[PDB]
Amino acid sequence: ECSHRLCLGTCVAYGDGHFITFDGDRYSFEGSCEYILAQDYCGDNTTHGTFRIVTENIPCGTTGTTCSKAIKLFVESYELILQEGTFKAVARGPGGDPPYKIRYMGIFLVIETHGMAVSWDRKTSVFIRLHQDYKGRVCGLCGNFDDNAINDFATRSRSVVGDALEFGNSWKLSPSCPDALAPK
């Protein structure tokens, strides 16, 4: 007999491109451009959604194998770039109080939004923990959080594929960017 407290869904984006989406699916994708790690901006109405998280692989001393990440935590009209070891703020829209909070959780930058907490190890792993409210209404490379892991390979046009490369290639920000070839 277990207490019935809700538990936060968890997406994990780490390493050379391993992802463990919200629904528990696991795969590997070696992408080089900017990829939407999450967003509410997918639906018959995009504009009732709030946040958006993009990531891409920074090399820290060369242009080769990845060494760190670059996160873009958009929250409504705000914005936070996570790179190079700390955060920034490029707030452009309405200038109210922050809908986020920032904390130094051990070896992590943790940024909360009262229902959506992002933890960044400051080098290459991102763990995102969401409230149960956002269930089924998110998308990107952390699946759609529907407790249905088979169809989490749902691309931009929601054409569930059996391949990881197409699913990753769908969520690149700039269509000009070249698609990643076969990972080796």
Partner 1 sequence: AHNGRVCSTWGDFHYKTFDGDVFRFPGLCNYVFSEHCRAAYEDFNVQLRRGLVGSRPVVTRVVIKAQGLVLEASNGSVLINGQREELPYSRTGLLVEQSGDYIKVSIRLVLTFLWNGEDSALLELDPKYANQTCGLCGDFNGLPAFNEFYAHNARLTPLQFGNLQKLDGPTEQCPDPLPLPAGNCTDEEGICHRTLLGPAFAECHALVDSTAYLAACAQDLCRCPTCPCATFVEYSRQCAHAGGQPRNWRCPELCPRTCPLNMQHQECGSPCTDTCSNPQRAQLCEDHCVDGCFCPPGTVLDDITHSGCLPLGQCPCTHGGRTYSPGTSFNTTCSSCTCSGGLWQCQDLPCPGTCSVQGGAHISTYDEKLYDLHGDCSYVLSKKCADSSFTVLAELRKCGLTDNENCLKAVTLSLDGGDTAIRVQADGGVFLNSIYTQLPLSAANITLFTPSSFFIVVQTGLGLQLLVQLVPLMQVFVRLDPAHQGQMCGLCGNFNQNQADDFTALSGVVEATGAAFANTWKAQAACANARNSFEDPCSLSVENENYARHWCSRLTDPNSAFSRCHSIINPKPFHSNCMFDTCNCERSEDCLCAALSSYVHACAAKGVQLSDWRDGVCTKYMQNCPKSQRYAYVVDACQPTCRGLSEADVTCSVSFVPVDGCTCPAGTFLNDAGACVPAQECPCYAHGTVLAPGEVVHDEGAVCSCTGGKLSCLG
Ligand X SMILES: *[C@@H]1O[C@H](CO)[C@@H](O)[C@H](O)[C@H]1NC(C)=O
Instruction: Give the footprint of partner 1 on this chain (CB under 8 A).
Output: 1-2, 23-25, 32-33, 41, 46, 52, 56-59, 61-66, 70, 74, 79, 83-84, 90, 92, 147-150, 156-164, 166, 173-178, 182
List the helix and strand counts (H, then E) for the chain.
Answer: 1, 12
133 binds ligand X (CB under 6 A): no
| First-residue to last-residue Cα distance in the chain | 46
Nearer CB in complex with Ca ion: 96/136: 136
121 binds Ca ion (CB under 5 A): no
Judged by CB under 5 A, which stretch of 23-31, 36-44, 120-128, 156-164 contacts Ca ion?
23-31
Within a 10 A sphere around the Cβ of 182, how many other Cβ atoms?
A: 6
User: Can you tell me which residue has the tokens 């490029």?
Assistant: 90
Q: How far is the CB of 138 from ligand X (least distance, A)?
A: 18
- 3-class SS of residue 169: helix
Rounded to an integer, what distance in angstroms lies between the CA atom of residue 92 and that of residue 96?
11
Nearer CB in complex with ligand X: 45/174: 45
The angle at the Cα of 141, spanning 143 to 100, to the nearest 5 degrees, equals 95
Nearer CB in complex with ligand X: 49/99: 49
Q: How far is the CB of 44 from partner 1 (least distance, A)?
A: 9
C-alpha dist (Å) from residue 54 to 79, 82, 96: 11, 10, 23
C-alpha dist (Å) from residue 77 to 7, 50, 66, 93, 95: 28, 9, 30, 5, 9
42 binds ligand X (CB under 6 A): no
Nearer CB in complex with Ca ion: 34/146: 146
137 binds ligand X (CB under 6 A): no
76 binds Ca ion (CB under 5 A): no
Judged by CB under 6 A, which stretch of 43-51, 66-74, 91-99, 140-148 contacts ligand X?
43-51
